[PDB]
Enzyme design. Sequence first.
Site, PDB file in Angstrom:
ATOM      1  N   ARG A 134       0.735  -1.015   0.190  1.00  0.00           N
ATOM      2  CA  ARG A 134      -0.038   0.007  -0.064  1.00  0.00           C
ATOM      3  C   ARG A 134       0.862   1.262  -0.064  1.00  0.00           C
ATOM      4  O   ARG A 134       0.141   2.259  -0.239  1.00  0.00           O
ATOM      5  CB  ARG A 134      -0.982   0.094   1.122  1.00  0.00           C
ATOM      6  CG  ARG A 134      -2.313  -0.857   0.668  1.00  0.00           C
ATOM      7  CD  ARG A 134      -3.253  -0.899   2.050  1.00  0.00           C
ATOM      8  NE  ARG A 134      -2.721  -1.631   3.237  1.00  0.00           N
ATOM      9  CZ  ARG A 134      -3.214  -1.879   4.517  1.00  0.00           C
ATOM     10  NH1 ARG A 134      -4.039  -0.866   4.698  1.00  0.00           N
ATOM     11  NH2 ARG A 134      -2.614  -2.744   5.254  1.00  0.00           N
ATOM     12  N   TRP A 194       2.323  -5.641  -8.897  1.00  0.00           N
ATOM     13  CA  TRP A 194       3.299  -6.342  -9.351  1.00  0.00           C
ATOM     14  C   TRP A 194       3.463  -7.465  -7.935  1.00  0.00           C
ATOM     15  O   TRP A 194       2.810  -7.256  -7.127  1.00  0.00           O
ATOM     16  CB  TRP A 194       4.780  -5.688  -9.701  1.00  0.00           C
ATOM     17  CG  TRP A 194       5.038  -4.672  -8.500  1.00  0.00           C
ATOM     18  CD1 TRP A 194       5.805  -4.965  -7.316  1.00  0.00           C
ATOM     19  CD2 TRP A 194       4.836  -3.150  -8.603  1.00  0.00           C
ATOM     20  NE1 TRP A 194       5.972  -3.804  -6.855  1.00  0.00           N
ATOM     21  CE2 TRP A 194       5.436  -2.648  -7.465  1.00  0.00           C
ATOM     22  CE3 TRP A 194       4.681  -2.258  -9.661  1.00  0.00           C
ATOM     23  CZ2 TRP A 194       5.583  -1.303  -7.274  1.00  0.00           C
ATOM     24  CZ3 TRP A 194       4.543  -0.917  -9.361  1.00  0.00           C
ATOM     25  CH2 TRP A 194       4.885  -0.381  -8.069  1.00  0.00           C
TER      26      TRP A 194
HETATM   27  C1  HEM Z   1       2.011  -2.455  -6.612  1.00  0.00           C
HETATM   28  C2  HEM Z   1       2.436  -3.705  -6.190  1.00  0.00           C
HETATM   29  C3  HEM Z   1       1.536  -4.449  -5.354  1.00  0.00           C
HETATM   30  C4  HEM Z   1       2.190  -5.396  -4.202  1.00  0.00           C
HETATM   31  C5  HEM Z   1       3.747  -5.644  -4.030  1.00  0.00           C
HETATM   32  C6  HEM Z   1       1.090  -6.078  -3.393  1.00  0.00           C
HETATM   33  C7  HEM Z   1       1.289  -6.832  -2.437  1.00  0.00           C
HETATM   34  C8  HEM Z   1       0.226  -7.790  -2.050  1.00  0.00           C
HETATM   35  C9  HEM Z   1       0.453  -8.921  -1.481  1.00  0.00           C
HETATM   36  C10 HEM Z   1       1.835  -9.821  -1.058  1.00  0.00           C
HETATM   37  C11 HEM Z   1      -0.706  -9.503  -1.289  1.00  0.00           C
HETATM   38  C12 HEM Z   1      -1.331 -10.921  -0.249  1.00  0.00           C
HETATM   39  C13 HEM Z   1      -1.987 -11.550  -1.330  1.00  0.00           C
HETATM   40  C14 HEM Z   1      -2.061 -13.003  -1.237  1.00  0.00           C
HETATM   41  O1  HEM Z   1      -1.301 -13.467  -0.461  1.00  0.00           O
HETATM   42  O2  HEM Z   1      -2.707 -13.653  -1.993  1.00  0.00           O
HETATM   43  C15 HEM Z   1      -1.685  -8.426  -1.367  1.00  0.00           C
HETATM   44  C16 HEM Z   1      -3.154  -8.526  -1.149  1.00  0.00           C
HETATM   45  C17 HEM Z   1      -4.008  -7.374  -1.565  1.00  0.00           C
HETATM   46  N1  HEM Z   1      -4.003  -6.501  -2.424  1.00  0.00           N
HETATM   47 FE1  HEM Z   1      -1.930  -5.931  -3.007  1.00  0.00          FE
HETATM   48  N2  HEM Z   1      -0.258  -5.461  -3.716  1.00  0.00           N
HETATM   49  C18 HEM Z   1      -0.002  -4.472  -4.884  1.00  0.00           C
HETATM   50  C19 HEM Z   1      -0.852  -3.732  -5.712  1.00  0.00           C
HETATM   51  C20 HEM Z   1      -2.327  -3.636  -5.372  1.00  0.00           C
HETATM   52  C21 HEM Z   1      -2.956  -2.883  -5.869  1.00  0.00           C
HETATM   53  C22 HEM Z   1      -2.805  -2.088  -7.323  1.00  0.00           C
HETATM   54  C23 HEM Z   1      -4.474  -3.123  -5.399  1.00  0.00           C
HETATM   55  C24 HEM Z   1      -5.883  -2.481  -5.963  1.00  0.00           C
HETATM   56  C25 HEM Z   1      -5.750  -1.430  -6.529  1.00  0.00           C
HETATM   57  C26 HEM Z   1      -4.084  -4.171  -4.353  1.00  0.00           C
HETATM   58  C27 HEM Z   1      -5.107  -4.601  -3.549  1.00  0.00           C
HETATM   59  C28 HEM Z   1      -5.012  -5.975  -2.699  1.00  0.00           C
HETATM   60  C29 HEM Z   1      -6.246  -6.401  -2.201  1.00  0.00           C
HETATM   61  C30 HEM Z   1      -7.659  -6.077  -2.276  1.00  0.00           C
HETATM   62  C31 HEM Z   1      -5.602  -7.671  -1.526  1.00  0.00           C
HETATM   63  C32 HEM Z   1      -6.194  -8.749  -0.555  1.00  0.00           C
HETATM   64  C33 HEM Z   1      -6.622  -9.575  -1.521  1.00  0.00           C
HETATM   65  C34 HEM Z   1      -7.754 -10.947  -0.776  1.00  0.00           C
HETATM   66  O3  HEM Z   1      -8.258 -10.469   0.494  1.00  0.00           O
HETATM   67  O4  HEM Z   1      -7.449 -11.926  -1.509  1.00  0.00           O
HETATM   68  N3  HEM Z   1      -2.781  -4.380  -4.321  1.00  0.00           N
HETATM   69  N4  HEM Z   1      -1.092  -7.191  -1.996  1.00  0.00           N
HETATM   70  C1  2SN Z   2      -9.796 -15.074  -4.443  1.00  0.00           C
HETATM   71  N1  2SN Z   2     -10.038 -14.048  -4.907  1.00  0.00           N
HETATM   72  C2  2SN Z   2      -9.763 -12.935  -4.028  1.00  0.00           C
HETATM   73  C3  2SN Z   2      -8.960 -13.569  -6.056  1.00  0.00           C
HETATM   74  C4  2SN Z   2      -7.521 -14.081  -6.022  1.00  0.00           C
HETATM   75  C5  2SN Z   2      -7.411 -15.128  -6.812  1.00  0.00           C
HETATM   76  C6  2SN Z   2      -5.636 -15.631  -6.876  1.00  0.00           C
HETATM   77  C7  2SN Z   2      -5.049 -14.944  -5.967  1.00  0.00           C
HETATM   78  C8  2SN Z   2      -5.621 -13.800  -5.135  1.00  0.00           C
HETATM   79  N2  2SN Z   2      -4.549 -13.248  -4.095  1.00  0.00           N
HETATM   80  C9  2SN Z   2      -5.097 -11.970  -3.648  1.00  0.00           C
HETATM   81  C10 2SN Z   2      -4.370 -10.940  -4.069  1.00  0.00           C
HETATM   82  C11 2SN Z   2      -5.039  -9.640  -4.324  1.00  0.00           C
HETATM   83  C12 2SN Z   2      -4.298  -8.557  -4.796  1.00  0.00           C
HETATM   84  C13 2SN Z   2      -2.770  -8.596  -5.045  1.00  0.00           C
HETATM   85  C14 2SN Z   2      -2.221  -7.286  -5.538  1.00  0.00           C
HETATM   86  C15 2SN Z   2      -0.942  -7.640  -5.650  1.00  0.00           C
HETATM   87  C16 2SN Z   2      -0.216  -8.884  -5.516  1.00  0.00           C
HETATM   88  N3  2SN Z   2       1.056  -8.970  -5.790  1.00  0.00           N
HETATM   89  N4  2SN Z   2      -0.828 -10.004  -5.072  1.00  0.00           N
HETATM   90  C17 2SN Z   2      -2.122  -9.590  -4.677  1.00  0.00           C
HETATM   91  C18 2SN Z   2      -2.977 -10.945  -4.260  1.00  0.00           C
HETATM   92  C19 2SN Z   2      -6.658 -13.462  -5.197  1.00  0.00           C
END
Ligand code: HEM
Ligand code: 2SN
Lengths: 410, 404
Positions: free
Chosen positions: B111, B280
């Site tokens: 974030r 990414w």
């Molecule tokens: C820019 C580089 C970004 C990095 C390095 C990053 C990193 C991460 C990581 C490591 C997770 C854990 C996901 C998992 O374990 O499956 C995550 C979750 C999440 N990210 Fe980020 N993210 C990025 C960009 C964004 C953007 C652009 C958005 C939305 C506009 C976003 C929204 C979210 C949301 C909503 C989750 C939770 C999704 C869930 O509960 O499955 N991220 N992010």
């Molecule tokens: C299960 N749904 C919420 C969709 C889905 C499918 C497969 C993987 C994930 N991971 C959650 C997630 C959400 C946002 C992300 C943003 C960046 C990032 N590097 N990983 C991110 C990972 C989410």
Amino acid sequence: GPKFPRVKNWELGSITYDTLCAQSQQDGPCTPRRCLGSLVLPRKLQTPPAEQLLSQARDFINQYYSSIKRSGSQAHEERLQEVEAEVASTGTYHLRESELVFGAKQAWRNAPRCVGRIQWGKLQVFDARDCSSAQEMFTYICNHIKYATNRGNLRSAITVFPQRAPGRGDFRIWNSQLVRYAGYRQQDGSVRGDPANVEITELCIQHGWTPGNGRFDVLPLLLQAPDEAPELFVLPPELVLEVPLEHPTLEWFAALGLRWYALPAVSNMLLEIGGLEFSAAPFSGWYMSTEIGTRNLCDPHRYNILEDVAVCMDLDTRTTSSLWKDKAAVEINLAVLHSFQLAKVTIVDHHAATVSFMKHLDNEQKARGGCPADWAWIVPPISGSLTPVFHQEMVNYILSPAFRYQPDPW
Amino acid sequence: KFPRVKNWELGSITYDTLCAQSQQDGPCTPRRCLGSLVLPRKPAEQLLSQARDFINQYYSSIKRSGSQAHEERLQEVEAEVASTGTYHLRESELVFGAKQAWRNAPRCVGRIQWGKLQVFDARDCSSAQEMFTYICNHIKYATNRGNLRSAITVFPQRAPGRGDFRIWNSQLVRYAGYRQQDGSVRGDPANVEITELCIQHGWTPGNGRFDVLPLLLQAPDEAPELFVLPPELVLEVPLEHPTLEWFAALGLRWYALPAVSNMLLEIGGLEFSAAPFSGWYMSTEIGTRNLCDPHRYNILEDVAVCMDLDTRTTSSLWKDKAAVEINLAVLHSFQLAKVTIVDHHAATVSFMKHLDNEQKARGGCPADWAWIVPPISGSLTPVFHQEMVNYILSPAFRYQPDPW
Ligand code: HEM
Ligand SMILES: CN(C)Cc1cccc(NCc2ccc3ccc(N)nc3c2)c1
Ligand code: HEM
Ligand SMILES: CN(C)Cc1cccc(NCc2ccc3ccc(N)nc3c2)c1
Ligand SMILES: C[C@H](O)[C@H](O)[C@H]1CNc2nc(N)[nH]c(=O)c2N1
Ligand SMILES: C[C@H](O)[C@H](O)[C@H]1CNc2nc(N)[nH]c(=O)c2N1
Ligand SMILES: [Zn+2]
């Protein structure tokens, strides 16, 4: 379907419901508005009118008689009556020996942060409720250490000193563990030894201890009998088993002069049973290797040896992306395991420990319809998702009997 | 009260007052904490109050609160809700809302980047074919030849008594998972169900371990349509290890763009059921979860065998050693290919800076500790030692049920 938390394991796709959380009588720190599950010590985790005492007593006596399958029996009702009498006449009551044993085990069984609970039924309970002096506490603690250490074949045990009593000082062990290394604040602001123990170290000095100056000086015990200044006791060196650290393939690792003690004996927690408070009840099990190798040795605010080891491994420490921290940490954990095994001192790796905890969860699902578990503490500090517990959803709640945090005696 | 929040490495204390702006209940109660659960268990005055609050957030953001423009906009929104039961956002409000939803996402460690998000308004979209066109442009823009750029594309909002726009795939890029009747799965087991849906909608399947899935896109009240992505749009990185020459022989690869496509974007009470977003990767998502999870590609033992590690016992830490080398290979390969990626140390360090920025800006930051702490080397990162407070703020990204 059912009106209870649905719990899912994402590796296996399996589902359980926790019904045991309905037996919780005490609130934790979370609300619908915000979760505080990651806090180490929220205010709703920090710690009597006979009405309050009696309800806690009756609940515990009910638990006891359930566990021996005599709920509703005449002995159950008589024990109840007898407790109500004691409390009517004295303001407090006393546990039968078998109730104390049941309660101690149940407190361990109930501890949400303990990954070792598969062992809960095998706990040697030492009754020290006759103890009447700090010298005698020392004798009891030495016996505990000898029994529990058992020349490296470690045995779980707890020693229970007299309960809190109205208008009388507490029995207290000032040290947080029976075995702790000194932390000496240096004139440059840094710390020699364990920075976790600076405060207890200075207290020992203030109370007359002659301090050393090494990295691994075993602290004396500061023991407090009711309404008395704490007294200082030095553990005889031969009672404190330690393991020198070496690595199976990196020959230089031994030259680092690192070591750790065999016995994790937690000594500053309150044991609460049926409203009775045991302010001195040290308990001990055996270590999981990550406690030593990851937390005690690698935490930045502990021994902090990660960079020293990485340098000896010739790693690139000027950039995160080399994963030098991860590489060094793994070899340090391996050294801990290898060294304890070589010394024939009980230890459990984080994979073996978490597999056994999964078995514990299954046992408890059948026996009690759930198991209170604090995910953040159960998942090991390295290799989290490589262990089965990472993929297991958990429900956290407070059951009693319980081990609870209590404020420091000073 | 408001929670005292401690960092155990530094000894520093904050107080989260931001949690008081939460108007949405999480799953915990005083009786029991459900903070480790992945998913939640499960009209007009309501909408108007969420709308007024969001509009207020928006004008506060541009330093124009209490302006004539602010007061008129609230009247527009109210007039629209009272007459039609719903209302519509201006582009600039939508842009602000998409950024705030990311900012408010307790599970996201990335974030620090929240203010840098390209927002594509795709609300003028009336068909699955048009959704595909927007999606292709999203991927093209975000991929940027490996110099990844964060983006979100927003398709039309949900409307009363009309089906939703939906992307059926959980990510824009996913590898097929083919169920063998001999129990096993070839490919990504996380994708068995979506792979089967594609096949019964007329996709001719491959039989490899890394077959990129077609997209199933659905316009309101219509069966979804199948769209194969042009291979030149989908950047992939072959995995090799800086020192272990045999690693490349494993034939492993991953795609560059993490583009989540099945979450619901809620802004001011309005719901966007299709709003795929991408950033990414942090290297552990690929190196640890996607490749090493037992219920995913599960490559730990293969790698351990090639490293000649003692697999007979847990106490040799073979799993830990193999996982580390796999994460290093992902980092090395992405770096070699000039494709953006961040390691879990750099990422959690940036997140701590984000926490500090947010404390000053808003008086706190909603964070989900179990998700912020990486799945290897937890306590080696600074976020492990940081107490966090989890709560739901709006605008928000939310889970929604699968459209089938
Ligand atoms: C820019 C580089 C970004 C990095 C390095 C990053 C990193 C991460 C990581 C490591 C997770 C854990 C996901 C998992 O374990 O499956 C995550 C979750 C999440 N990210 Fe980020 N993210 C990025 C960009 C964004 C953007 C652009 C958005 C939305 C506009 C976003 C929204 C979210 C949301 C909503 C989750 C939770 C999704 C869930 O509960 O499955 N991220 N992010
Ligand atoms: C299960 N749904 C919420 C969709 C889905 C499918 C497969 C993987 C994930 N991971 C959650 C997630 C959400 C946002 C992300 C943003 C960046 C990032 N590097 N990983 C991110 C990972 C989410
Ligand atoms: C037998 C082998 C045992 C193992 C492997 C084990 C393992 C662990 C571990 C790894 C922790 C987390 C420690 C930390 O990170 O500081 C823990 C916590 C805890 N253990 Fe166990 N344990 C064992 C025995 C016992 C016994 C005998 C008792 C009590 C009778 C006990 C009660 C507790 C309690 C109350 C906590 C939480 C402490 C806190 O909140 O600070 N354990 N255990
Ligand atoms: C602060 N007090 C709760 C005492 C204290 C001091 C230092 C460390 C810990 N860790 C908690 C704790 C409690 C019981 C344990 C039982 C066995 C074990 N291997 N580690 C255990 C760790 C506990
Ligand atoms: C802030 C966070 O709660 C704190 O660092 C916790 C995390 N999980 C833990 N888990 C265990 N087993 N022991 C600990 O001391 C901690 N510390
Ligand atoms: C059961 C547990 O909540 C689940 O395995 C969580 C743990 N933490 C996570 N953390 C991240 N970043 N991503 C995840 O999918 C999960 N899964
Ligand atoms: Zn909670």
